[PDB]
Write a protein that binds this ligand. Sequence first.
Ligand SMILES: CC(C)(COP(=O)(O)OP(=O)(O)OC[C@H]1O[C@@H](n2cnc3c(N)ncnc32)[C@H](O)[C@@H]1OP(=O)(O)O)[C@@H](O)C(=O)NCCC(=O)NCCS
Ligand SMILES: *C(=O)CCCCCCCCCCCCC
Lengths: 8, 392
Amino acid sequence: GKSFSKPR
Amino acid sequence: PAKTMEEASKRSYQFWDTQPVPKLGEVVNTHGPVEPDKDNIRQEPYTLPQGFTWDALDLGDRGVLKELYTLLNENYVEDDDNMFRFDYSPEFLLWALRPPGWLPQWHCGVRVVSSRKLVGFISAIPANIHIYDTEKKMVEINFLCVHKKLRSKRVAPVLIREITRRVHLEGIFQAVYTAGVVLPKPVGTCRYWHRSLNPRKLIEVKFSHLSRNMTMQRTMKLYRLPETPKTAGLRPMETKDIPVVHQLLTRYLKQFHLTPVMSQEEVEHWFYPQENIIDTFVVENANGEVTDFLSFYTLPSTIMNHPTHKSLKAAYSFYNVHTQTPLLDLMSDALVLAKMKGFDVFNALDLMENKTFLEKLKFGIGDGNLQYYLYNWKCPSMGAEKVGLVLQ
Ligand SMILES: CC(C)(COP(=O)(O)OP(=O)(O)OC[C@H]1O[C@@H](n2cnc3c(N)ncnc32)[C@H](O)[C@@H]1OP(=O)(O)O)[C@@H](O)C(=O)NCCC(=O)NCCS
Ligand SMILES: *C(=O)CCCCCCCCCCCCC
């Protein structure tokens, strides 16, 4: 992305 | 930077207020450019702070490509907790940055005059974009990066204005881009979801946590996958599949409101398999006809400051087209294939029809939004399920 996500 | 939209409307945007984008607060009921095309373009590069110079990067030079790899490996996007950082490979960067139509002046680097150290970058690639009822030639902006030591010094606005200028010179006046931050003004807001493939590793590195009421043994059994895919006739895409994959993609995308319009050459570039970069599998049925395909690209991340686990291997859902195989079955085989190829996690956004399978296939919702933006184009926002564009 332009965003490193992780499980909430 | 703001993460929530409500938190962003308390913010003032000293740079974005000067740009032809809608204001965060206004509602858009029109379809068209924010401002007319310019018929004279500034010929001179914008001025950088003293001691820094522009340098267009020849990514065909192995040494220069490696400098960009290192800039991004050390300074590009991190998660919120500063535990993980994208680790785009050199060969992946070539894939992302030299698609058909790529231009050398659009690989826009900034160097320290004395040391020549690469400290900044921004890129454009050309792309034909369908937005509601309009097809426009645009650019896709990506890989905006300022060295950590140069941050908060007004350098990113100069990179943006300079790439804008260099794109204007080529006759293009619209762009599409994505950000994890809220800016004026999202055309669409998507959400990353994650499907564990190696739950143990993910927990040890604190990418994920154990669910409140279940054990590690349970978590491992929960995420176990078959050893091999189930869809009849699934195989890797070959050169002979380029036309039908283009056909399938083009027809499938018509149902969304923000999509690329790819030539057959662009389809070859973006989907033809390259190990450790892009995987595409087609379904060739009992009659020899290709009726579906799945695809995902390879993007590992550095695990920062960890003594044993240094990298996290992630697969990213790309474009998945179904016409005879159920999408749910297609994506289950994607997961199995990613597991087989050694990935630790499988990521996918909630755009296109992905919400129809995310929960059923045991994805967990992420903490990061991916906002989609258009530059110099006014149109109504759309729900995630109407976004049909995936960027690297
Ligand atoms: C993004 C990055 C280039 C910004 O550089 P910076 O030194 O922190 O920001 P600057 O001081 O140069 O100027 C900030 C201006 O550019 C805007 N801006 C910040 N990040 C932006 C981004 N990814 N895209 C577009 N504009 C951005 C800011 O909103 C601000 O404009 P504003 O006054 O209207 O709010 C830098 O932080 C970076 O390299 N981050 C890691 C890679 C990355 O792109 N992360 C962004 C994910 S959303
Ligand atoms: C993430 O790296 C994307 C960063 C987007 C920065 C803003 C770009 C705005 C559009 C500039 C090009 C306009 C060409 C007409």
